[PDB]
Design an enzyme around this catalytic site. Structure first.
Site, short mmCIF file in Angstrom:
data_model
loop_
_atom_site.label_atom_id
_atom_site.label_comp_id
_atom_site.label_asym_id
_atom_site.label_seq_id
_atom_site.Cartn_x
_atom_site.Cartn_y
_atom_site.Cartn_z
N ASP A 32 -50.13 33.21 -3.19
CA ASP A 32 -49.72 32.04 -3.97
C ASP A 32 -50.78 30.86 -4.21
O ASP A 32 -51.09 30.25 -3.34
CB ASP A 32 -48.77 31.62 -3.16
CG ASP A 32 -47.91 30.36 -4.06
OD1 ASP A 32 -48.17 30.16 -5.12
OD2 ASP A 32 -46.79 29.69 -3.50
N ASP B 94 -51.43 29.73 -11.41
CA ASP B 94 -50.33 29.87 -10.27
C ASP B 94 -49.96 31.41 -10.07
O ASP B 94 -48.92 31.64 -10.75
CB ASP B 94 -49.28 29.20 -10.44
CG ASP B 94 -48.35 28.99 -9.24
OD1 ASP B 94 -48.52 29.74 -8.39
OD2 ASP B 94 -47.15 28.42 -9.35
N1 LIG Z 1 -46.20 28.67 -6.75
C1 LIG Z 1 -45.12 28.50 -6.11
N2 LIG Z 1 -44.86 29.00 -4.68
C2 LIG Z 1 -43.71 28.77 -3.92
C3 LIG Z 1 -43.24 30.41 -3.85
C4 LIG Z 1 -42.21 31.13 -3.34
C5 LIG Z 1 -42.55 31.28 -4.71
N3 LIG Z 1 -42.95 32.26 -5.63
C6 LIG Z 1 -42.26 33.48 -5.80
O1 LIG Z 1 -41.19 33.74 -5.10
C7 LIG Z 1 -42.82 34.55 -6.76
C8 LIG Z 1 -41.90 35.27 -7.42
C9 LIG Z 1 -42.46 36.12 -8.45
C10 LIG Z 1 -44.01 36.25 -8.50
F1 LIG Z 1 -44.67 36.78 -9.39
C11 LIG Z 1 -44.74 35.21 -7.91
N4 LIG Z 1 -43.94 34.48 -6.69
C12 LIG Z 1 -43.86 28.33 -2.82
O2 LIG Z 1 -43.76 27.01 -2.82
C13 LIG Z 1 -42.36 26.69 -3.56
C14 LIG Z 1 -42.60 27.74 -4.43
C15 LIG Z 1 -42.52 27.35 -6.04
S1 LIG Z 1 -43.86 28.02 -7.17
#
Ligand SMILES: NC1=N[C@@]2([C@H]3C[C@@H]3NC(=O)c3ccc(F)cn3)COC[C@H]2CS1
Ligand SMILES: NC1=N[C@@]2([C@@H]3C[C@H]3NC(=O)c3ccc(F)cn3)COC[C@H]2CS1
Length: 391
Positions: A38, A234
């Site tokens: 992430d 992101d």
């Molecule tokens: N980049 C952020 N990160 C967070 C992570 C948990 C979320 N992301 C996901 O579940 C997720 C789903 C699908 C994807 F392709 C990538 N990621 C952590 O901080 C809060 C949340 C918001 S957006």
């Protein structure tokens, strides 16, 4: 071009809808966990208590090297929440650099709409900077610890590999989803040249967009609108997210370019799937989208160009159906532009923290057709680019 990081190539699994993850170990003896990569957050946080969606979790009582920081953390966000207890422990990445780091770990004890059923991941590796760490900027992020404690260069790179068709949980587990190269650039993962945009500020991986085109046609908005109130890269967001006003303009333009077919409002709102008979997806009716980014040279920009094969996300209808089905993976934002996983699947992305810059090249694993590919191209003369940033 030689590929000099064989040990880390193909170390990711997953997909844009549920996230891309890497295997890590925590504690002594090592506890293996799958961890979401992430770039839009800065905490290393792992399931540390039973949850209906977790097959395994971090057991602090079984680690001889666990250190309790005696401090809680509560992380509410728009689409969910997690809370936990801070500590440190020894951490390794089996398909990574051959090093062990003592890092901060938030042991997640309660959560809401955080874990994803069937995603296969059990924690998150926030790779952004300390400024946005929780509870505050004093909690050193993982990558900072890694660089401080080892000889690993201050850079990582991501190749997220979308299949171009749906994968079930069993298939994700058995398939390669990409590469996270820790400490370097692997030249086998891209074609053409790498082009670099400055990191505007070290918090998120913030960049500046200076122009947007749909099939070559300028969206013609004031460039501050593209970066209102920020633009970031992101890997922890599925979609390309655009500020409300930009989303409205872009969707109008994409509808116009694709106007030979009418799609329901639910499709454009990212909610509803659309389906075509097997093999008949009309890629050619959908436009390419180009984002121009500030270059490293004074008064120079470059562009990245994605295809509908990036911004239409493959989804299953039913296991029995032979139709090819997709959701529209561009959506509105009230927190700025987010270049999420579906965008990143087009490109090899270099997070050059050492030189405060992000590189893009065409991914060797991007989905395309016989007629068009994704592109990274430049240079373009562009004046007053700093003025595109929002203050
Ligand atoms: N980049 C952020 N990160 C967070 C992570 C948990 C979320 N992301 C996901 O579940 C997720 C789903 C699908 C994807 F392709 C990538 N990621 C952590 O901080 C809060 C949340 C918001 S957006
Ligand atoms: N880089 C180039 N681009 C072109 C198209 C976009 C590329 N795709 C292919 O070459 C190709 C070949 C077989 C296949 F199963 C899928 N795709 C467009 O211009 C000339 C053509 C060949 S070389």
């Amino acid at each position: 071009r030689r590929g000099s990081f064989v040990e880390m190539v193909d170390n990711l699994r997953g997909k844009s809808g549920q996230g891309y993850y890497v295997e890590m170990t925590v504690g002594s003896p090592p506890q293996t966990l799958n961890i979401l990569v992430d770039t839009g957050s800065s905490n290393f946080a792992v399931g540390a208590a039973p949850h209906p969606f977790l097959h395994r979790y971090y057991q602090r009582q079984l680690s001889s090297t666990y250190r309790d920081l005696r401090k809680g953390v509560y992380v509410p966000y728009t689409q969910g929440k997690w809370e936990g207890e801070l500590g440190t422990d020894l951490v390794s990445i089996p398909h990574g650099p051959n090093v062990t780091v003592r890092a901060n770990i938030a042991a997640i004890t309660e959560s809401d709409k955080f874990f994803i059923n069937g995603s296969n991941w059990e924690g998150i590796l926030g790779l952004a900077y300390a400024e946005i760490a929780r509870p505050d900027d004093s909690l050193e992020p993982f990558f900072d610890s890694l660089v401080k404690q080892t000889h690993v260069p201050n850079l990582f790179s991501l190749q997220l590999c979308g299949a171009g068709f749906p994968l079930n949980q069993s298939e994700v587990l058995a398939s390669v989803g990409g590469s996270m190269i820790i400490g370097g650039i692997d030249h086998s993962l891209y074609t053409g040249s790498l082009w670099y945009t400055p990191i505007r500020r070290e918090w998120y991986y913030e960049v500046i967009i200076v122009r947007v085109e749909i099939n070559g046609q300028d969206l013609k908005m004031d460039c501050k609108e593209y970066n209102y109130d920020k633009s970031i890269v992101d890997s922890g967001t599925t979609n390309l997210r655009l500020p409300k006003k930009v989303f409205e303009a872009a969707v109008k333009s994409i509808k116009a370019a694709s106007s030979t077919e009418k799609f329901p409002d639910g499709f454009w709102l990212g909610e509803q799937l659309v389906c075509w008979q097997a093999g008949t997806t009309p890629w050619n009716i959908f436009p390419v989208i180009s984002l121009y980014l500030m270059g490293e040279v004074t008064n120079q920009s470059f562009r990245i160009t994605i295809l509908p094969q990036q911004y239409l996300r493959p989804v299953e209808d039913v296991a029995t159906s032979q139709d090819d089905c997709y959701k529209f993976a561009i959506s509105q934002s009230s927190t700025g532009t987010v270049m999420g996983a579906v965008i990143m699947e087009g490109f090899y992305v270099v997070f050059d923290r050492a030189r405060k810059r992000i590189g893009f090249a065409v991914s060797a694993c991007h989905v395309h057709d016989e007629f068009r590919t994704a592109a990274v191209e430049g240079p373009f003369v562009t004046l007053d680019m700093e003025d595109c940033g929002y203050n």
